[PDB]
Design a binder for this molecule. Structure first.
Ligand SMILES: *C(=O)c1ccc(CCN)cc1
Lengths: 237, 86
């Protein structure tokens, strides 16, 4: 998160840090006690197997995420139409071996329903442990920032992403830059409040550099994938 | 089966139309059936009824046919979407 501020305790209780080899790699979003939504690009070979993955929930600071205290991931499921070249359909699921215990610091986000009728420039939040500047290191503390949805037409224009923004993608940020996601934040949440509920609108996916003008963040459009997610969750058993 | 919009309106598809479900006869035991059907296992939260498509569906999720009787189903399968400042 470039241009945000330290998250408060329990502000973003669905945010998890996903670790490989005892370090933060990725963000994710809790949707059930056992199911976590992330990006497909995070679990590309050679990180497709569940054994490499642990999840920390409910902890703001990396230095309080202790070896052996995380949740072992048991299943990794990438979207069948994930295309690594274009980053299209960049959503994956992780299932935990043991369910999480919900409390004040650890709670799920709502999957989006069709008919959300979001504003074209809906006010959203992003959170995570990504760099706080382009090419920086993992942030010790979880950060969050307000961003607006950027309209697809505008995002696909010649001076922004030029026809790279598909229907399974949504853009967010500011075209002046300064506030954005960055590396480490990927797989993490883009959320918005509506009707007094926080909804998962997107999963941090891709874009060019961090916090540069005309180079916003691109998110997987979780609304287009909810039915796949429901099928995945139903099939498990 | 699906929940539609920010009020979680249980709808069912033809068999090019979705049609909500009447709160006539509904209980929290029929609520769980639609939730498991959606993939949520033994997760349940609330299944209240709310204000009204014109064609509805009255009474697991193949026991209904297109009706009218005041109030539709609002199904929440999980307590989600809350944080520090509510
Ligand atoms: C993932 O870590 C990731 C997502 C989006 C961006 C682009 C922000 N302009 C970078 C990295």
């Amino acid at each position: 998160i470039v241009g945000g501020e330290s998250a408060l305790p329990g502000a973003w209780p669905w945010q998890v840090s996903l670790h490989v080899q005892n370090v933060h790699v990725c963000g994710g979003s809790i949707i059930t006690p056992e199911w976590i939504v992330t990006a497909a690009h995070c679990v590309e070979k050679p990180l497709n197997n569940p054994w490499h993955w642990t999840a920390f929930a409910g902890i703001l600071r990396q230095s309080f995420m202790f070896y052996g205290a995380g949740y072992q991931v048991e299943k990794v499921i990438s979207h069948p139409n994930y295309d690594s070249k274009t980053k299209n359909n960049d959503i994956a699921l992780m299932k935990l071996q043991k369910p999480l215990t919900f409390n004040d610091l650890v709670k799920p986000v709502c999957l989006p329903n069709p008919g959300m009728m979001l504003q074209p420039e809906q006010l959203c939040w992003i959170s995570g442990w990504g760099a706080t500047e382009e090419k920086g290191k993992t942030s010790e503390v979880l950060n969050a920032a307000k961003v607006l949805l950027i309209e697809t037409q505008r995002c696909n224009s010649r001076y922004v992403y030029d026809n790279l923004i598909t229907p399974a993608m949504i853009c967010a940020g500011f075209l002046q830059g300064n506030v954005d996601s960055c590396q480490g934040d990927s797989g993490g949440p883009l959320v918005t409040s509506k009707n007094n509920i926080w909804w998962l609108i997107g999963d941090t996916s891709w874009g060019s550099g961090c916090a540069k003008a005309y180079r916003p963040g691109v998110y997987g459009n979780v609304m287009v994938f909810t039915d796949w997610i429901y099928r995945q969750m139903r099939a498990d058993g | 089966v699906r929940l539609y919009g920010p009020n979680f309106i249980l709808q069912v598809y033809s068999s090019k139309s979705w049609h909500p479900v009447c709160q006539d006869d509904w209980n929290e035991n029929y609520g769980r059936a639609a939730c498991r059907d959606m993939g949520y296992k033994n997760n349940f939260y609330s299944s209240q009824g709310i204000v009204d498509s014109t064609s509805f569906m009255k009474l697991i999720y193949k026991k209904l046919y297109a009706c009218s009787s005041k109030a539709v189903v609002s199904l929440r399968c999980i307590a989600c979407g809350v944080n520090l400042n509510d």
